[PDB]
Structure formats: structure tokens, C-alpha cells
Design a protein around this ligand. Sequence first.
Ligand SMILES: Cc1cc(N)c2cc(NC(=O)Nc3ccc4nc(C)cc(N)c4c3)ccc2n1
Length: 257
Amino acid sequence: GETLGEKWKKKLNQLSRKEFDLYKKSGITEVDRTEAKEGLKRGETTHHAVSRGSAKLQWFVERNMVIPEGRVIDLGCGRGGWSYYCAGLKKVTEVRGYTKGGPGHEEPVPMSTYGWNIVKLMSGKDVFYLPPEKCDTLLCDIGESSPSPTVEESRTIRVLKMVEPWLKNNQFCIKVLNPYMPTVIEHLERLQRKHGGMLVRNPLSRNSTHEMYWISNGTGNIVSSVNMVSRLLLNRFTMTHRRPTIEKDVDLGAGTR
Ligand SMILES: Cc1cc(N)c2cc(NC(=O)Nc3ccc4nc(C)cc(N)c4c3)ccc2n1
């Protein structure tokens, strides 16, 4: 070291509140969640995504980076945004979501968006002790940020260690909270050797996170991709502020499959 990502993290931790709030959205893409949030406030159960996560996963799926099919397991499903998005996909036959829930954590949100009847979301489940199950698609969006990159390093490696027993001849999309710490890079290189895939930056991620996703389809140089993200995020500190690109949120429809 020290890595480009660690330099980015230092500068991020130096920002004031107003500088941070400007920087985190500068030049990013984001979905307009206003209508959806009002719908959830009213208890509406059709069309709305339960989180910004549905659109986030959609970005990967529309580029065939992960192609949900068959039995989908969603580790750390939270409200269920990834699960309910997958439930509407023709090739998907079953969605099982597991999440901790309870105090301080999001509970699954019951919905009747398209394909809801093939979704089972289970709260009260600690995925770090959950025996691996056969699945055709493995999703995991777990990783708690911290101002400390070393804390994030341990959290990230713990997530990667937990998800690996679930991976075998299947599609996957796994969040890598901190991909730039050298120990994480080494684990990712061994993981790519065992299971393939590639590390990709989602443009709906805010500039305040260096998160990248390990997706199953394709290949590439992990260090080069991480460093590309680090340079982008570093340059956005001094780039003139740019308003984010606002897109419409996803419409997940209604009814049973
Ligand atoms: C306040 C808050 C913030 C988040 N980013 C959350 C994410 C989630 N999504 C997750 O996957 N969370 C999560 C988060 C941390 C976890 N830790 C262990 C040891 C086991 C788990 N099954 C587990 C799950 C859930 C609740 C959240 N609550």
C-alpha cells in the first residue's frame, strides 16, 4: 500500500457535512423513489419496489452480468428489493430470502408485485450460521460501511467467507463492501480462480461508497477494475459538482405467476 481506495477513504473522512452531501451524488445515477416511498407509506402492495435495490440489481441483470434463473437464494434480503425483482423474471422459478430482521435491521416487506407467490422471505435468520442450500442463483447484498477501512476489510472478508460455500455452477451477484484493501484483493483473486466472474461497479452506487459487485458472468482483471473505480471516485472530489441523473424507478407490476 497504500492503495488508491485508501486515499479516497481518507479524503472522504475529511469532508464536512455539506461537502459530503454534495460529493456523494455528484455525477451519479439514481432512481426517483418519491412515488414508491409514498406508496409504501400507504401500505400499497402492487407496482412499487420496496427499496432502491430493485433498480440496482436490474442494472446488472439487463447487462447479463447475472442472469437470475431457477431457484434464487437472496442472503440478507432485508425488505426484499432483490427478491421481488427476481420473482418477476421468466426464468426464475423460486425465490428464498433470508435476513436477520429484529431491532436495528430491516424486516421483509410483504408485497403483491408480479410473481410474489413464488417468494418466501424469512426473517430471524443469521446467514453466517445458515447451512448452504442448492440454488441456481445466489445473491448477497450484505456489508455494513464504517469510517474505518480496516473494520470494513474484516466485514468484507467475513461476507466472502460466508457466501463461498453457496457457490457451485450457479449464477451469483455478491456485494464487496470494500474491494480495495490488499487482503480483500487477494481473497477476490482466489475466489475468481475458484468460481470465475468479475468485479463491477454499479453506476447507481453513491460516490460515498467504494462498493463493487462480484458477478458471475465474464472475466477481467480485478486490480485494474478496482483501481479504475478509485481513480473515478478520487477525481470526483475536485470535479465541478454535477447534478445526478434521475431515472424513473422500476415498476414491478402485480399479480401471481
Ligand atoms: C439500519 C440497517 C441498515 C442496513 N444497511 C441494513 C441492511 C440489511 N440487509 C442485510 O443483509 N443485513 C444484515 C446485516 C448484517 C448481518 N449480520 C449477520 C451476522 C447475519 C445477517 N443475516 C446479517 C444481515 C438489513 C438491515 C439493515 N438495517
